[PDB]
Amino acid sequence: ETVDAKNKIHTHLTKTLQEIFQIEMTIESIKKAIKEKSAFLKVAQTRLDERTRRPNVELCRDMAQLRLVNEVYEVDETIQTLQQRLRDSEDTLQSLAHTKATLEHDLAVKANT
Amino acid sequence: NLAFTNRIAETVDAKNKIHTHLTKTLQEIFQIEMTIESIKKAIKEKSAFLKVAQTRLDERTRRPNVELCRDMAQLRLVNEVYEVDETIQTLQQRLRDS
Amino acid sequence: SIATDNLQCRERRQHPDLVRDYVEVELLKETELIRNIQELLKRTIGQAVD
Amino acid sequence: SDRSAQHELEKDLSDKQAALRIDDKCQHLRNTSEGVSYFRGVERVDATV
């Protein structure tokens, strides 16, 4: 049962290497999403800062401003959720690396037999 | 109209060296962007070194019952891990200040 | 340097003929084009050594 | 009296023209616009008449 046990561990290890490659690609995609949402915050808040330099009666409580406040709040919730997703993906990659090291050790000790 | 001559020379000088200050400010903003890019590259390189050292130590520590040995390289690896931790934290503090 | 020199040069112009003519918009395009060109040259220089 | 009302409309016209320039430059501001930067606390800071 050494031979087919070793083959089972070998199949598990090969597919585990595949799945870890996909999880690393997922990590980089979450990073790209984070940096683009940061640039969108930059654009919205620069527009809101420049807008309030108006003359005296032109300071107006417009629906544009009552929408820009919800703009900044919604992009804040977006970047918060994507940061949470980054932490969770790092945690799952940690668990995958643990399983990889465990089955590497078991592959070696069964291959000695 | 000499009062107007006074006022226009005065405001024109204000314009001119406002323009000078603006040019210097833009050039320093350029170099600030280049420095924070250098900081980010340094942080990811130090993260790679931490990966290498801690992978080496956890690959080493699976040794059999007789060869569980406290060599010099184990102590060196532990010191290296906490040294690169201190390095990484200092780089994030400099990033936030910049 | 020559584009910024011409942009600062065209601010000596007397107040009737201080103009936003065909020259001004093309000089603005020149400045942005030159900066885009040399930033992209810096990025492909970064690609080469890697 | 006619001169007074004409000057009132002229100062209001100056206010509208400057606000038009501000809202135009805000309207054409896209991403990759080469004029953006971070701003902190602007989501709370307002003067409003």
Partner: peptide, 17 residues
Amino acid sequence: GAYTSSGLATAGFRTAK
């Protein structure tokens, strides 16, 4: 490629005319 991540802060400035 397209410089979609880096934004410098300046242009060739003239105000209003």
